[PDB]
Amino acid sequence: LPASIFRAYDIRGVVGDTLTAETAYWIGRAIGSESLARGEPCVAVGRDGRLSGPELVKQLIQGLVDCGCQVSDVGMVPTPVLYYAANVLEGKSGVMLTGSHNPPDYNGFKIVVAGETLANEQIQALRERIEKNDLASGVGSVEQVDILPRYFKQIRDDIAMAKPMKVVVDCGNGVAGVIAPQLIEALGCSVIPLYCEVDGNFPNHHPDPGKPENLKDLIAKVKAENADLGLAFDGDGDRVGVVTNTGTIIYPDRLLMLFAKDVVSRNPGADIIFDVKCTRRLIALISGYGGRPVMWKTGHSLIKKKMKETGALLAGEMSGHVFFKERWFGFDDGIYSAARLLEILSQDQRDSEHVFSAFPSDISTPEINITVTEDSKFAIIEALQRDAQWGEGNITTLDGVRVDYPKGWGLVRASNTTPVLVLRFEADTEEELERIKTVFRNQLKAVDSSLPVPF
Ligand SMILES: O=P(O)(O)OC[C@H]1O[C@H](O)[C@@H](O)[C@@H](O)[C@@H]1O
Ligand SMILES: [Zn+2]
């Protein structure tokens, strides 16, 4: 098996190339062996709506059963529905076969063993088990479980909308269309569907709400139908993107402000996690409401671990993964998050544009990406962490280097999904944004004067 598919947060490859049916079998065998080693024979399995789903899921399931595992096959479901299954069924282990927001031929595995989402050395440990033949052998079993209705009811029974809303829902032809439009209607909304037929060819736009290009159809429909809100889901339903009644894109760090207010109001002193890419305004906002702001590393699996370590009631990433523990289970779930957003907005007499515009705003950049190499990206960060001078500011090195200045901040870190450096800048003036950019530009050039600086 190729080493490149074993990534920091999960497993991901290209079907036909780096991820075959046989690889899926052996990955199943490794996960089943690790689950058993943690005392957990029961493993839930789900898949998204990708073309390669049926082929690879059978092999994944067989690998697990060949360890002696008891598999609960939940069929085709959103990622969070698989996480849900691993919280409410007998077993605390689960595997989701998904390639997330990537092009059609990509697939992969997001893995929970005995309650914990695997990352880093734990993901490599699976690859290492296969190489070593450190694998369990036994005769397992498979039971079909129809879990979607239970999930649907769980959310419906706990969300209380105070008024009706009209909402455009763009599924991007991903697996969210199996439930999101139906659930949102059941909450007391009317839903205008966009690309909600599940189709793994992704013939309209990629289900990647983090790019504004993939929200253009949603924004136009919101305006044309005079809708109260627009929602877009990524391919496997663990990410959500939001647009207001006037078409304004609400970035996830700003969504989190609304959610942090909600959660902290019922839970004084609650820990609230956000990643290094999120606005500093969120930090002040959480503290002002009496919560404890906890900045952490990018990556769904890393955020979920940090939530267990801190007891945080809510987490969010700039990528749109939002993780409710309060009233919920602590996993990232775009569908549940949409429902929580609708609950809050429905209790407000103002429109969604005005609810979000009331929070402070700064001037910010879109995520910047510089392509380096897979085998040099971490070394560039290490050199910055060793050598760099940032001027006066609060320096955080938990993920790359983030520096928080009086009037703004900057970040440079290595991506764990691509061979790139990722940067973000925010400040309260254009002048300050340029000052911080110049600091980072000069520090990168000090490490490697040939490095591109396309900001
Ligand atoms: O910045 P990175 O490391 O490339 O990851 C960015 C995003 O990738 C995926 O969408 C997920 O794993 C998210 O959890 C993460 O926020
Ligand atoms: Zn996703």
Heteromolecules bound: 6-O-phosphono-alpha-D-mannopyranose, zinc ion
Number of domains: 4
Q: What is the tally of beta strands?
A: 22
| Largest sheet, strands/sense/barrel | 7 strands, mixed
Principal-axes geometry comes out as globular
Family: Belongs to the phosphohexose mutase family.
GO molecular function: magnesium ion binding; phosphoglucomutase activity; phosphomannomutase activity
Keywords: Alginate biosynthesis, Isomerase, Lipopolysaccharide biosynthesis, Magnesium, Metal-binding, Multifunctional enzyme, Phosphoprotein, Virulence
Cofactor: Mg(2+)
Describe, in plain words, how this protein is organized in 3D.
With 455 residues, the chain is α/β, with parallel strands linked by helices. The chain is built from 14 helices and 22 strands. Strands 1, 2, 3, 4, 5, 6 and 7 form a seven-stranded mixed sheet that branches. β10 and β11 form a beta hairpin. α1 runs parallel beside α2 and α1 crosses α4. Bound molecules: 6-O-phosphono-alpha-D-mannopyranose and zinc ion (ZN). Zinc ion binds next to loops. The PDB classes it as isomerase. Keywords: alpha/beta protein, phosphohexomutase, phosphoserine, enzyme-ligand complex, enzyme-metal complex, isomerase.
Task: Write a brief caption for the model.
The PDB classes it as isomerase. The chain is of the alpha/beta class and 455 residues long.
Secondary structure: elements and pairs:
Elements: E1 11-14, H1 21-37, E2 42-47, H2 53-65, E3 70-76, H3 79-88, E4 93-97, E5 106-113, E6 116-117, H4 121-132, E7 141-144, H5 148-158, E8 165-170, H6 180-186, E9 189-194, H7 216-224, E10 229-233, E11 240-244, E12 249-250, H8 252-266, E13 271-275, H9 280-288, E14 292-296, H10 300-310, E15 314-316, E16 322-324, H11 334-346, H12 352-357, E17 363-364, E18 368-371, H13 377-387, E19 394-396, E20 401-405, E21 408-414, E22 420-427, H14 430-447
Parallel strand pairs: 2-3, 2-4, 3-7, 8-9, 8-10, 13-14, 13-15
Antiparallel strand pairs: 1-5, 4-5, 5-6, 10-11, 11-12, 15-16, 17-22, 18-22, 19-20, 20-21, 21-22
Helix pairs in contact: 1-2, 1-4
The structure holds 6-O-phosphono-alpha-D-mannopyranose (M6P) and zinc ion (ZN).
The site of zinc ion (ZN) has 7 residues, from loops.
